[PDB]
Design a protein around this nucleic acid. Structure first.
Ligand code: MN
Ligand code: MN
Ligand code: ZN
Ligand code: ZN
Ligand code: ZN
Ligand code: ZN
Lengths: 162, 162
DNA sequence: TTGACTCTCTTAA
DNA sequence: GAGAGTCA
DNA sequence: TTGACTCTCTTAA
DNA sequence: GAGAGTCA
């Protein structure tokens, strides 16, 4: 199996390639009526994507390296976390975009957490709006807000109490 | 069935049957260090469930009625909303548990909203902790909190900025 | 060894 | 969070 | 007509 | 949010 040195070499090659991705400046809500700036390193929309990268789904990619004649492959956003525990509280760790921009591979925009923690960031009020995530959000979640509920709780008769 | 009268009759028979489900009291976090009380009307764990009800999944049920000699069937939590639009902004409307208790069929604990709005209530701080849902939450979402993130944003080299 | 495609799977609403 | 079919 | 089961599907992380 | 196969 791959040694610590070899894993570090994979992480270094990945950072070197992703660093050359187009860097896109995005203005984003931080919460509390404030605006901030994130710099996303975005994988191209179509091939070629960069050395070692290939698209396996509409917004899914993989990173591949061949070491000592053995092909190794990882989810494209998982590479920064190859030296980290891969589960916690009995839940699989997932790459989680703090910038909510799937094409971005900036490791400063990623964290490594359960799928539930990951999803929940979609509704976070943001780092200036009351975020309580221990690994703080970089921005207000895209789905934060009052929502668009069509109908609320209601009854026709008198069979129920809240 | 097609007629408003037939729909109201479906809603009324559904409410009468559900009104006979056992009422279970649940004490719940509201946010802000406060606690409240909900009264859930819980479908039985095993057959028989009640007139018109049958289980199609571990925590999925359907309500069925014969109208004009034809069988009509609905997801068991959708019946209160049969007179409401079934989509919003091009997204399917879903029955959404404000009590986060799938067996509960209390319509005073249900709303009708997109799957995204529905999911997002899992992380809401709650009605006394800052909920901004226009149709207000009845409790703090069960997944609200700091999370259990294993690793935060990081880079080995100097190629990235936030 | 490498790129560019292909397929199906996980989770919890 | 859903829809629909098989049996009795 | 009603009940009690079976199966697969949707969505967006 | 994932893993793995095929072909050249
Ligand atoms: Mn995410
Ligand atoms: Mn829900
Ligand atoms: Zn980014
Ligand atoms: Zn947050
Ligand atoms: Zn309830
Ligand atoms: Zn809320």
């Amino acid at each position: 199996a791959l040694t610590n040195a070899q894993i570090l070499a994979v992480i270094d090659s990945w950072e070197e390639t992703v660093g050359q991705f187009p860097v896109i400046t995005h203005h984003v809500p931080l919460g509390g009526g404030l605006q901030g700036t994130l710099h996303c390193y975005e994988i191209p929309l179509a091939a070629p994507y960069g050395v070692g990268f290939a698209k396996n789904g509409p917004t899914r990619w993989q990173y591949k390296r061949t070491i000592n004649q053995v092909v190794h492959r990882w989810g494209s956003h998982t590479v920064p976390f190859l030296l980290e525990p891969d589960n916690i509280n009995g839940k699989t760790c997932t790459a989680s975009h703090l910038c909510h921009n799937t094409r971005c591979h900036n490791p400063l925009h990623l964290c490594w957490e359960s799928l539930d923690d990951n999803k929940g960031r979609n509704w976070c009020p943001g780092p200036n709006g009351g975020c309580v995530h221990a690994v703080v959000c970089l921005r207000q979640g895209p789905l934060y807000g009052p929502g668009a509920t069509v109908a609320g709780p209601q009854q026709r008769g008198s069979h129920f109490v809240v």
